[PDB]
Amino acid sequence: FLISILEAIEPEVVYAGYDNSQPDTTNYLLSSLNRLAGKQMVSVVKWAKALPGFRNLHLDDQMTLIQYSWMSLMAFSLGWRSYKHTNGQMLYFAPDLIFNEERMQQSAMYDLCQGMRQISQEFVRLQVTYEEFLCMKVLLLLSTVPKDGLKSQASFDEMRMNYIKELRRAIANNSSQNWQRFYQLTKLLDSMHDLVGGLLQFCFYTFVQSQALSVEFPEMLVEIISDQLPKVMAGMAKPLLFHK
Ligand SMILES: C[C@]12CCC(=O)C=C1CC[C@@H]1[C@@H]2[C@@H](O)C[C@]2(C=O)[C@@H](C(=O)CO)CC[C@@H]12
Numbered sequence: 001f002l003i004s005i006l007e008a009i010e011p012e013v014v015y016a017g018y019d020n021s022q023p024d025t026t027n028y029l030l031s032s033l034n035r036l037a038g039k040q041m042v043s044v045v046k047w048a049k050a051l052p053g054f055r056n057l058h059l060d061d062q063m064t065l066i067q068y069s070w071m072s073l074m075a076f077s078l079g080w081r082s083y084k085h086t087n088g089q090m091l092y093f094a095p096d097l098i099f100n101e102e103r104m105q106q107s108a109m110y111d112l113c114q115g116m117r118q119i120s121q122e123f124v125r126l127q128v129t130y131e132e133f134l135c136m137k138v139l140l141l142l143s144t145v146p147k148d149g150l151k152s153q154a155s156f157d158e159m160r161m162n163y164i165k166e167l168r169r170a171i172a173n174n175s176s177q178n179w180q181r182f183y184q185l186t187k188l189l190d191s192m193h194d195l196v197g198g199l200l201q202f203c204f205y206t207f208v209q210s211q212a213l214s215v216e217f218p219e220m221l222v223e224i225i226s227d228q229l230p231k232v233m234a235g236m237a238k239p240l241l242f243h244k
């Protein structure tokens with residue numbers, strides 16, 4: 001039922017509104033992705049609010065969690081779309097904006113693009129199911145927290161454990177085979193932190209020099225990044241890992 005609910009609140013595909021008549025310069029590609037991110041942020045916030053348990057958290061905890069995990073959420077979903085639509089060969093940012101070798105090159109962030117493609121490749125290797133993906137995505141929203149704790153810690157812990165259990169349900173082969181899959185899927189979850197660290201570094205860097213580098217960011221993103229950046233830079237957040 002919880003899983004059936006996740007299927008129901010899963011956001012509909014978001015288009016980039018990309019204009020292919022324009023040259024694919026780094027400035028245009030990055031600005032287009034930032035605009036896409038803004039549109040995706042709207043879907044993310046709406047999705048989170050509809051998530052069983054999220055509403056029970058303090059308003060500040062809700063904002064904090066979205067602020068710290070939006071990049072991981074979008075990168076993970078990108079990995080899923082690329083997996084389903086291109087078997088992990090291209091980055092399916094949006095139906096109207098798919099990154100091939102050429103775009104990855106002109107984006108000036110080829111390596112980060114490959115890091116994200118590696119996620120899709122893991123989905124392929126493990127043949128991640130839609131149910132597993134849905135539960136894992138919720139866990140990402142609940143895997144980067146303030147070092148000083150949350151206001152509704154108790155409720156948070158309970159929520160997190162519920163979705164972890166839901167994930168094991170999706171996984172459920174004998175018990176040892178289920179354990180192995182839990183091990184592998186949570187290894188994938190933990191791997192998101194390092195990738196996201198690199199994604200956020202370039203995001204913050206281009207954000208800080210948005211005007212000078214002519215890389216546009218929509219208001220939906222500017223507000224969030226403006227607040228998130230200092231917190232992250234000061235080392236106020238920490239990951240909730242599944243492995244040593
Ligand atoms: C959210 C984003 C787009 C939507 C989506 O499906 C998946 C992602 C993940 C990668 C993200 C992009 C988008 O932020 C453009 C970037 C974020 O600013 C890059 C910039 O720094 C551009 O200035 C670095 C990391 C990129």
Ligand code: NA
Nearest residue numbers: 060061064150
């Ligand atoms: Na908080």
Ligand code: NA
Nearest residue numbers: 118121122125
């Ligand atoms: Na792989």
